[PDB]
Ligand binder design. Structure first.
Ligand SMILES: [Mg+2]
Ligand SMILES: [Mg+2]
Ligand SMILES: [Mg+2]
Ligand SMILES: [Mg+2]
Ligand SMILES: [Mg+2]
Ligand SMILES: [Mg+2]
Ligand SMILES: [Mg+2]
Ligand SMILES: [Mg+2]
Ligand SMILES: [Mg+2]
Ligand SMILES: [Mg+2]
Ligand SMILES: [Mg+2]
Ligand SMILES: [Mg+2]
Ligand SMILES: [Mg+2]
Ligand SMILES: [Mg+2]
Ligand SMILES: [Mg+2]
Ligand SMILES: [Mg+2]
Ligand SMILES: [Mg+2]
Ligand SMILES: [Mg+2]
Ligand SMILES: [Mg+2]
Ligand SMILES: [Mg+2]
Ligand SMILES: [Mg+2]
Ligand SMILES: [Mg+2]
Ligand SMILES: [Mg+2]
Ligand SMILES: [Mg+2]
Ligand SMILES: [Mg+2]
Ligand SMILES: [Mg+2]
Ligand SMILES: [Mg+2]
Ligand SMILES: [Mg+2]
Ligand SMILES: [Mg+2]
Ligand SMILES: [Mg+2]
Ligand SMILES: [Mg+2]
Ligand SMILES: [Mg+2]
Ligand SMILES: [Mg+2]
Ligand SMILES: [Mg+2]
Ligand SMILES: [Mg+2]
Ligand SMILES: [Mg+2]
Ligand SMILES: [Mg+2]
Ligand SMILES: [Mg+2]
Ligand SMILES: [Mg+2]
Ligand SMILES: [Mg+2]
Ligand SMILES: [Mg+2]
Ligand SMILES: [Mg+2]
Ligand SMILES: [Mg+2]
Ligand SMILES: [Mg+2]
Ligand SMILES: [Mg+2]
Ligand SMILES: [Mg+2]
Ligand SMILES: [Mg+2]
Ligand SMILES: [Mg+2]
Ligand SMILES: [Mg+2]
Ligand SMILES: [Mg+2]
Ligand SMILES: [Mg+2]
Ligand SMILES: [Mg+2]
Ligand SMILES: [Mg+2]
Ligand SMILES: [Mg+2]
Lengths: 159, 296, 211, 145, 169
RNA sequence: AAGCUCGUAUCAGUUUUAUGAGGUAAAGCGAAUGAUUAGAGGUUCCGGGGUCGAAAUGACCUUGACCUAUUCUCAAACUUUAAAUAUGUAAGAAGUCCUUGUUACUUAAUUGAACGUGGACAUUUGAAUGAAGAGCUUUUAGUGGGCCAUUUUUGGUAAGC
RNA sequence: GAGAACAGAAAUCUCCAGUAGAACAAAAGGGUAAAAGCCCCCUUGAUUUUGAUUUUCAGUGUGAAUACAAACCAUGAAAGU
RNA sequence: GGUUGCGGCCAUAUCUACCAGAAAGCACCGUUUCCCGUCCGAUCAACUGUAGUUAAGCUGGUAAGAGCCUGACCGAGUAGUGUAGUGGGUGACCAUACGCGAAACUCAGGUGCUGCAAUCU
C-alpha cells in the first residue's frame, strides 16, 4: 500500500547540512521574538520536539504567540481555491527572523531622512523606487583600443 | 606519528571540527545551553550565572550574563583579592572559597542598590538557608551556579563559593546535600561541621594535629603560618574578621598597575614572532632547490 | 532464447544497476577489457585510435564481447599479440529486464535478462594504442568491430600520446624535460604543488632543467 | 495570456504603446511568440493617433477628433491637444502612464502589403513575424493603419 | 633535553586468565589479593566460545592494577623469576612492557593446597610526568612527541636500573 | 439565480526589487557509501603453495589477500557541489518617530510584555502593468465512465496498449 | 596497530590510533559523541483537569503528534528537564 | 601585544612533522588529617603554594606539507534548462531563435576574527 506518514518524503529536507551536525549554536537560543515579528520556517532535524510539518518548510509567517520554548506562527495555507489560517507551534530551533522586510525598513528610515533633508532645504524629493531604465547615449573611444576582428573557427576534434 | 596510522585526504576533508571552546576542553555546551537560555516570554531578561572556577590555586567568581556577541561580566571577584581583607594564606581552600563568594555577593549587591536591604545572614552558624524576599520591596538578585566542569561531590568546595554568595545576600537556589557535613545515610546536615569548614576548622585541625605528631611536614607546608606566626586557633578569627572587612567595604580596588597598556604591548612584541611574506617563502623554496637538488 | 537486440537499443528506462535491490542478475558476457601488451610503457605506444559512438543508445554485453574478440583477433594475427593495446572503454552496468511467460498483463515486472552499456554521442567505446607504424592495422581492427554494433560509430585518430591526457608534443615537452616518470602501464607527472622534500626524492632527473 | 491582458492586447492585430524598463522588458520577453513590436517613429505615432486614436472616458471609447476631448480628460496633466498627446507618448513624458492609458488600444487592420514572410509564428530573425523587429515595426504598422 | 621528563612507572597490572568461574577463579582471585593488598577485579567473558568452554558474562578471570612503590616490589619480585632477562618483543611500540610467569609461588608467597597453583601476566605501563594532561577531565590534551614513551627509551630504562638483559634481535 | 453593502476603491493564473525555501537536470567517483578494468610499488613471527633445511620468531622464490600512490567505467532506491522551470514572504495611514498611563503577567528593579492617552510628517505616501469596479450572503441544477496533443514520465519487446 | 604464562584465528590484561566506519527493540530514512550510544544512582510525568493546534481533511471523525494553562509530583548543586 | 576566566561566529580555528616562547598567568607538580571516590588518591575529593619544572599542556613560527577558506572573462557562455517553428532526420537523435545558466577543472591569494572582565615588562 501507499505510505503517507507525517515526515514522509523528507529524507533530504530535514537532513542536516554537510559538516554541520550536532549541538545547535547558542545564538539560536539567544535570539528574541515578539508578536508581529515575521519569521522564516526551517526544520532542524536534530530537534525532534516542536517540529514544523514538511509543508511549512521554507515558509514565512507572523508570530502570534510567545511561550516558554516556542513561538506560535500563523501561515496562510491555500487549500482548494482559497487560503485558510493555520497556526504553528514551533520551537525556536526551527524559526528565524526574516530579512524580507529589512530592505523595506531600511528604505523607510532612509525615506524619512531625505524627505526632511529636502523639505528643510527647498522641496524636490523623488522617493519611489524605479525599475532599471534603459541606458543612455555614450561615446566609446578607440584610443588604446582598436577593434579586434574575430571570425568563426574551423571544426576540429581533439580527443 | 606511526606510518600505518596517519590521516588521509579523505579523513581530514570530511572532518567536522567540534566547536572550539570544546576542542579546548573548556566549555560543556550541553550545560551552557541549559544554563543560559531564557523563557521566551521574558524577552530581553538576562539570565545571570555565578561562575566559579578553580585555577591551580586562585578562585574566580564572576556574575556573568549572555549576549550573542559574547558574554558579560556584571561583577568579578578573585580570591587573590583576599589579602586586602586579612587573608594571606591558603587561598584555594574551602573557607577562601566561601569568603570570595561572600565578596562577590556583597560587591554586586552593592553596585545594584540592594545593598542595605538584603544583608543575608551576618551571624553564620552554617544553618541551611537561602535569602528570602522582603515583604513589599525588591525581590533579591537571583543567580545560578556555574560549576563548569567541576565534579559534583558532596564536600566539594565549589559549593563553598555558593554558600557565601548565598550567605552574602544573593538568591542562589540550592539544596543542602553537597555541603561538608551532609549525612549520606540520613537526609540530614550536621551544621557544626559546615560552620567548621566556613571558618577553616578542617585546616586548623590539621595544623594542630601535626604540631606534635610530625614537625617535618608541618614545617614544609604551613611554612608561611610559621613565618607570620599564626598557629592554628587564631585561624577562625582571621576569617571571622575577613567577613567583617569584606562586608564593611567590598567595592573592589583595581591594581595600581605601573607601566601603561602601551608598554606591556611593546615589550611583549619583542618575543612575538611574526609571519612571513610569500615572496620570502618563494625565496626559501628556490633556495632549497638550488641547494638540495643541484647535486650539492 | 535471447531477444533480438532491437528490443533494447534505446535508453527507454532509467539505469537499473545490479544492487541490493536487484541482486539475481546474470553475468556480463564481456569480462576482459584490456588485452594485448597492456604491461607496456607509455613511451612504447604513441599513436592512439578510438571507436566512438555517434548515437545515444545501448550496447549489449554480448555485442561488446563479440566486438572485443573480433578486433583483438584481427589485430594480433596481422600484427602480433604484443603489437597493440586494446582497451574496451565501456562497461555494461545497466540491467535489462524481461517479462517471461494463468495471468497476462497483470503485474508485469521483468526479471533480469542481460546487461548493456549505455553510451552517449561522442562517447568512446574502444581505445587502441600502438606504434605509428601500425595505424592501418589498428584502424582495420576497429572498422571490423563496427560490424558488431547497433547504431553508427566512427573511428577517430587521436591527437594524444597513447592513453595519456596530452597531445603528442606537450607530452614530449614534458618528457624530454624531467616531469614524467614511468609507472605500471601509465605514468606519473611532477607536480609543482606539495612537499618540496619528497617531491625531490621522486623525479631526480628534474631539478637541473635540461636533459 | 495574463500578460497579453495586462498590456491590453486582447484581440488580434490590436496594438498599444509600452514604456521600456526592466519590469516591462520582461513582460515583452514573456510574450514574443504572440506579438510583433519595435520602435515607433514620430511619423507612425502621429498617424496612429490622428487616424485611430480613441480615448477612454467613463470607459466608452470616444474618438478624438476634437482637442476639447483631450483637454477634458488629460488637461489635468498639462496636455490639451491631440499633439500634446503625441508629444507625451513619443518623449515618454512624466505622465506617460496617464497619457498612454487614456488611449484605447489601437485597432489595426491586417497589413495591406501582406506579412513579408510565409509563416508568421517564427521570430522575425528567422524569417517570421514575431519578436522585436526594431525600426522595421513602422513599415508594418503603417500597412496596418 | 631533560629535567623532569624522567620515566616513572604508571601502573602495574597483573592478570590471571582462567577459562571458568567458581572455585578455580576465586582461588585465583585470592592469589591476587594477598599479593597486591588491594581487592581484585573480575572479568566476564565477552562472548562465547564452547571450544574454550565459556559463556557470555561468565566471570572468567581476575586482575589488579597497582601503582606507587608497591608496584616496584612486585615488578622486581617477578623480574626475579624471569632472572632479569626479557625479550625485544615484550616492549610495546608505545613504551610499556610485560611478561608471564607460571607458578605464583616463585615470588615470595607460600603454597597452601587449598589455593592451588596459578600463572600470572605482568604488564608494566610506563610514562613521564604530565600524563595527567591526557587523563584529567578539563582541557584534555595529548602529550608532545618529544615526551611520549617510546620502545627504545623504555628498553634503555629497563637496561639501566635493574641491570637486566633485553636479549634477542 | 436572487441580490445586498459599498465604490476609486480595493482588486490580479503578470513583471520588477528585496529576502527565503528546495536536492531534480547536470555534475562527481586520483570526495563518503556501493559497484568496476588494469597494471606499479610496498608490508607479514602471520592464507597457502614450493628449494635449502634438524629446526627456526630462518633465508630465498611464489600466489593470494591487505597498504600506498596511480588507472579505465558506473547509481531510481549513492553523493561534497548544484541549476533552469516552478515556490514562501515583503514593497507603509492597519505606516514611521516622540512624550509617558494600565496590569493580578514579568523583571533585581515602573524593568519588560501587551493594550493605550497626548504630539510630529500627506499623496513621488513610497516599484511596474492592468482593473467594463470591489466585497459579501443565501439557495439550487447538472456532473461525479472521460478521451486527446507537445513536453516530463512508470510498467511493457511492443501497441490505435 | 603494538605488547603479556598455559592461550591457539577466537578467552582475559595494557597502551596507541579512531567523525562514529557502532549502538539506540523492530522496516527504512532522518537524527545523536563530555550524547540520543555504555555503566551507575534516584524514580513513576506511562499521572489529574478540561480547551487550542499540526498531519490526513469535508478543513468531519478517528489515529498519531505539537505548544500552552490549572494541579500534583520525579530528578538534579542548579539552570532545568 | 601576552595571559586568564566567560564567550560569539564554529578548520583561514583541523591534521602531520620540527623549532621558538621574556614577564605574569595557566600548567605540570608536593601531600593524605579532614569532606568525598576508587580494583588503583591515575581519574575524582580534600590540604599545601610550601618542596620542583617549562619537559609536556598552552601560545606562536616554519613547510614548492595534507585539509579548509576566498577569488578569477581558468574551464564555460560549456553541460543542463523555460520558451518558439508545418525546422533537419527512417529513427536514435540534432541544429536554429528570444532567454536563464552550473559542477568538476585550472591558476592565484589566504591559514582564525573577535566581545566582556581581571592581570602582566
Ligand atoms: Mg511508497
Ligand atoms: Mg560532532
Ligand atoms: Mg517524545
Ligand atoms: Mg590509514
Ligand atoms: Mg589528493
Ligand atoms: Mg552536567
Ligand atoms: Mg527521452
Ligand atoms: Mg519504461
Ligand atoms: Mg485470463
Ligand atoms: Mg505476458
Ligand atoms: Mg504483483
Ligand atoms: Mg513481484
Ligand atoms: Mg555499426
Ligand atoms: Mg584524469
Ligand atoms: Mg499598455
Ligand atoms: Mg500599400
Ligand atoms: Mg492585394
Ligand atoms: Mg502594391
Ligand atoms: Mg506555406
Ligand atoms: Mg488600411
Ligand atoms: Mg625541564
Ligand atoms: Mg576451562
Ligand atoms: Mg502567486
Ligand atoms: Mg527526492
Ligand atoms: Mg543523473
Ligand atoms: Mg552521466
Ligand atoms: Mg560534482
Ligand atoms: Mg565511489
Ligand atoms: Mg540523484
Ligand atoms: Mg511569483
Ligand atoms: Mg500599485
Ligand atoms: Mg490603469
Ligand atoms: Mg470601472
Ligand atoms: Mg450547487
Ligand atoms: Mg451538488
Ligand atoms: Mg465515485
Ligand atoms: Mg452530487
Ligand atoms: Mg493541442
Ligand atoms: Mg533507524
Ligand atoms: Mg555534556
Ligand atoms: Mg498509559
Ligand atoms: Mg480522531
Ligand atoms: Mg496511522
Ligand atoms: Mg615563569
Ligand atoms: Mg582513605
Ligand atoms: Mg596526586
Ligand atoms: Mg581534585
Ligand atoms: Mg619547549
Ligand atoms: Mg589551558
Ligand atoms: Mg596547503
Ligand atoms: Mg549538446
Ligand atoms: Mg531547453
Ligand atoms: Mg519537432
Ligand atoms: Mg545547444
Amino acid at each position: 500500500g501507499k505510505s503517507h506518514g507525517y515526515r514522509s518524503r523528507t529524507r533530504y529536507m530535514f537532513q542536516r547540512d554537510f559538516r554541520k551536525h550536532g549541538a545547535v549554536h547558542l545564538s539560536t537560543y539567544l535570539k528574541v521574538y515578539k508578536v508581529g515579528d515575521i519569521v522564516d520556517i526551517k526544520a532542524n532535524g536534530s530537534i525532534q520536539k516542536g517540529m514544523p510539518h514538511k509543508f511549512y518548510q521554507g515558509k514565512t509567517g507572523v508570530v502570534y504567540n510567545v511561550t516558554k520554548s516556542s513561538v506560535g506562527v500563523i501561515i496562510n495555507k491555500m487549500v482548494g481555491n482559497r487560503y485558510l489560517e493555520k497556526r504553528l507551534n514551533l520551537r525556536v530551533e526551527h524559526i528565524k527572523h526574516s530579512k524580507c522586510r529589512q530592505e523595506f525598513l531600511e528604505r523607510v528610515k532612509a525615506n524619512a531622512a531625505k524627505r526632511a533633508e529636502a523639505k528643510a532645504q527647498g522641496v524636490a524629493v523623488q522617493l519611489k523606487r524605479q525599475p532599471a531604465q534603459p541606458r543612455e547615449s555614450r561615446i566609446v573611444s578607440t584610443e588604446g583600443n582598436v577593434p579586434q576582428t574575430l571570425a568563426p573557427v574551423p571544426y576540429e576534434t581533439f580527443i | 606519528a606511526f606510518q600505518k596510522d596517519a590521516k588521509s585526504s579523505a579523513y581530514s576533508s570530511r572532518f567536522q571540527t567540534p566547536f572550539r571552546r570544546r576542542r579546548e576542553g573548556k566549555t560543556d555546551y550541553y550545560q551552557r545551553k541549559r544554563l543560559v537560555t531564557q523563557h521566551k516570554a521574558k524577552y530581553n531578561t538576562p539570565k545571570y550565572r555565578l561562575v566559579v572556577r578553580f585555577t591551580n590555586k586562585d578562585i574566580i567568581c564572576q556574575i556573568i550574563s549572555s549576549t550573542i556577541t559574547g558574554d558579560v561580566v556584571l561583577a568579578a571577584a578573585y580570591s587573590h583579592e583576599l589579602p586586602r581583607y586579612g587573608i594571606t594564606h591558603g587561598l584555594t581552600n574551602w573557607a577562601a572559597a566561601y569568603a570570595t563568594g561572600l565578596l562577590i555577593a556583597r560587591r554586586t549587591l552593592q553596585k545594584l542598590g540592594l545593598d542595605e536591604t538584603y544583608k543575608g545572614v551576618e551571624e553564620v552558624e552554617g544553618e541551611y538557608e537561602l535569602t528570602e524576599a522582603v515583604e513589599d520591596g525588591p525581590r533579591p538578585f537571583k543567580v545560578f551556579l556555574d560549576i563548569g566542569l567541576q565534579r559534583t561531590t558532596t564536600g566539594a568546595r565549589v559549593f563553598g563559593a555558593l554558600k557565601g554568595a548565598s550567605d552574602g545576600g544573593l538568591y542562589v537556589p540550592h539544596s543542602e546535600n553537597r555541603f561538608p557535613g551532609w549525612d549520606f545515610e540520613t537526609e540530614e546536615i550536621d551544621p557544626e561541621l559546615l560552620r567548621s569548614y566556613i571558618f577553616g576548622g578542617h585546616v586548623s585541625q590539621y595544623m594542630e594535629e601535626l604540631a606534635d605528631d610530625d614537625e617535618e611536614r608541618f614545617s614544609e607546608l604551613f611554612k608561611g603560618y610559621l613565618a607570620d606566626d599564626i598557629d592554628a586557633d587564631s585561624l577562625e578569627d582571621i576569617y571571622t574578621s575577613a567577613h567583617e572587612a569584606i562586608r564593611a567595604d567590598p567595592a573592589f580596588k583595581p591594581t595600581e598597575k605601573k607601566f601603561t597598556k602601551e608598554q606591556y604591548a611593546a615589550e611583549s612584541k619583542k618575543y612575538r614572532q611574526t609571519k612571513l611574506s610569500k615572496e620570502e617563502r618563494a625565496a626559501r623554496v628556490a633556495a632549497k632547490i638550488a641547494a638540495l637538488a643541484g647535486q650539492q | 532464447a535471447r531477444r533480438p537486440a532491437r528490443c533494447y537499443r534505446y535508453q527507454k528506462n532509467k539505469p537499473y544497476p545490479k544492487s541490493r535491490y536487484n541482486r539475481a542478475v546474470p553475468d556480463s558476457k564481456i569480462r576482459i577489457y584490456d588485452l594485448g601488451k597492456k604491461k607496456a610503457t607509455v613511451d612504447e605506444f604513441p599513436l592512439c585510435v578510438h571507436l566512438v559512438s555517434n548515437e545515444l543508445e545501448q550496447l549489449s554485453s554480448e555485442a561488446l564481447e563479440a566486438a572485443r574478440i573480433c578486433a583483438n583477433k584481427y589485430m594480433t594475427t596481422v600484427s602480433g599479440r604484443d603489437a597493440f593495446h586494446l582497451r574496451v572503454r565501456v562497461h555494461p552496468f545497466h540491467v535489462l529486464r524481461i517479462n517471461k511467460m494463468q495471468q497476462g498483463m497483470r503485474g508485469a515486472w521483468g526479471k533480469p535478462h542481460g546487461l548493456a552499456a549505455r553510451v552517449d554521442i561522442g562517447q568512446i567505446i574502444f581505445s587502441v594504442r600502438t606504434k605509428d607504424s601500425n595505424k592501418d592495422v589498428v584502424v582495420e581492427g576497429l572498422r571490423r568491430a563496427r560490424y558488431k554494433f547497433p547504431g553508427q560509430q566512427k573511428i577517430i585518430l587521436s591527437k594524444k600520446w597513447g592513453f595519456t591526457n596530452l597531445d603528442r608534443p606537450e607530452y614530449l615537452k614534458k618528457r624530454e624535460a624531467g616531469e614524467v616518470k614511468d609507472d605500471g602501464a601509465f605514468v606519473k607527472f611532477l607536480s609543482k604543488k606539495g612537499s618540496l622534500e619528497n617531491n625531490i626524492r621522486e623525479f631526480p632527473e628534474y631539478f637541473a632543467a635540461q636533459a | 495570456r495574463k500578460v497579453l491582458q495586462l498590456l491590453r492586447l486582447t484581440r488580434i492585430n490590436s496594438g498599444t504603446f509600452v514604456k521600456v524598463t526592466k519590469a516591462t522588458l520582461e513582460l515583452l520577453k514573456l510574450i514574443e511568440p504572440y506579438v510583433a513590436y519595435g520602435y515607433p517613429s514620430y511619423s507612425t505615432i502621429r498617424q496612429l493617433v490622428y487616424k485611430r486614436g480613441f480615448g477612454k472616458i467613463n470607459k466608452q471609447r470616444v474618438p478624438l477628433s476634437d482637442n476639447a476631448i483631450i483637454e477634458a480628460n488629460l488637461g489635468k496633466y498639462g496636455i490639451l491637444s491631440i499633439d500634446d498627446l503625441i508629444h507625451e507618448i513619443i518623449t515618454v513624458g512624466p505622465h506617460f502612464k496617464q497619457a498612454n492609458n487614456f488611449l484605447w488600444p489601437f485597432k489595426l487592420s491586417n497589413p495591406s502589403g501582406g506579412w513579408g514572410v510565409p509563416r508568421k509564428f517564427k521570430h522575425f530573425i528567422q524569417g517570421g513575424s514575431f519578436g522585436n523587429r526594431e525600426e522595421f515595426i513602422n513599415k508594418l504598422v503603417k500597412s496596418m493603419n | 633535553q631533560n629535567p623532569m621528563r624522567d620515566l616513572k612507572i604508571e601502573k602495574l597490572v597483573l592478570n590471571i586468565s582462567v577459562g571458568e568461574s567458581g572455585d578455580r577463579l576465586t582461588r585465583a582471585s585470592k592469589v591476587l589479593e594477598q599479593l597486591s593488598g588491594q581487592t581484585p577485579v573480575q572479568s566476564k567473558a565477552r562472548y562465547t566460545v564452547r571450544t574454550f568452554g565459556i559463556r557470555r558474562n561468565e566471570k572468567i578471570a581476575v586482575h589488579v592494577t597497582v601503582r606507587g612503590p608497591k608496584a616496584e616490589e612486585i615488578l622486581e619480585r617477578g623480574l626475579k623469576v624471569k632472572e632479569y632477562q626479557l625479550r625485544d618483543r615484550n616492549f610495546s611500540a608505545t613504551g610499556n612492557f610485560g611478561f608471564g610467569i607460571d607458578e605464583h609461588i616463585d615470588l615470595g608467597i607460600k603454597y597452601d593446597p587449598s589455593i592451588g597453583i596459578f600463572g600470572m601476566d605482568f604488564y608494566v605501563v610506563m610514562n613521564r610526568p604530565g600524563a595527567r594532561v591526557t587523563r584529567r577531565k578539563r582541557c584534555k590534551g595529548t602529550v608532545g612527541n618529544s615526551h611520549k614513551t617510546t620502545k627504545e627509551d623504555t628498553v634503555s630504562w629497563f637496561k639501566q636500573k635493574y641491570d637486566a638483559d633485553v636479549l634477542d634481535k
